[PDB]
Symmetry: C2
């Protein structure tokens, strides 16, 4: 059995999430992670699942979001997860510089998705002027 | 039982969208639009419902999304719609200033949301 399956059969639901989101596990399947995170959103429980975690769980989740945010299939949930973690733990970045960095790294990545989207638009205007 | 629901179950995804995003209708309901749009996303049908549209329809959907994106109930969907629309249409915005303008304005809000989160960390 994969660690996440055991975790779910026992009541260790917080651990379960850490298990599917563990990308360096041999049995890791990114699609499974996306599945669970999108399943929780569909069930209106994404926030609840994400709250009341210790610093290590949260950093790992931030990092997962950051790994996939630039992938058009994962981007929606990564963006959601980012915003959910902000509203939940932005008050606890005090007793940690390790947590405040991962937040920045993720937000920098999100801001880049927006900046890359801006270029896709404004370039057309640039090519327009150039061809005339 | 409603036309947008029938269009949906019948796979006329784009027609359902055109229904729920018609704000001039007595029964226009942002919550219904949200229900539909998320429903498409769950069926992996959102891109399909947004694709193959004329310029004016794209400008109108972008505009619709700008109106709810800051609301946490709608943000996730609205941001997706932005990205979906960018991927599908950004290449054609040459010589279409109105559309480029509309894209920029929606992005500006998506930007604003990211900024607010940055501000929450600091």
């Amino acid at each position: 059995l994969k660690p996440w399956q055991k975790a779910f059969r026992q009541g260790r639901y917080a651990a379960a999430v850490d298990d599917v989101l563990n990308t360096t596990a041999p049995s890791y399947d990114p699609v499974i992670a996306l599945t669970l995170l999108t399943a929780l959103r569909h069930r209106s429980a994404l926030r609840e699942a994400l709250q009341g975690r210790d610093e290590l769980s949260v950093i790992n989740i931030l990092r997962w979001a950051g790994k996939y945010v630039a992938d058009p299939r994962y981007r929606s949930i990564c963006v959601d997860v980012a915003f959910h973690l902000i509203d939940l733990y932005a008050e606890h970045v005090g007793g940690s510089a390790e947590l405040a960095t991962q937040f920045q790294q993720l937000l920098a990545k999100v801001n880049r998705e927006v900046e890359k989207a801006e270029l896709a638009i404004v370039t057309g205007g640039m090519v327009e002027s150039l061809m005339m």
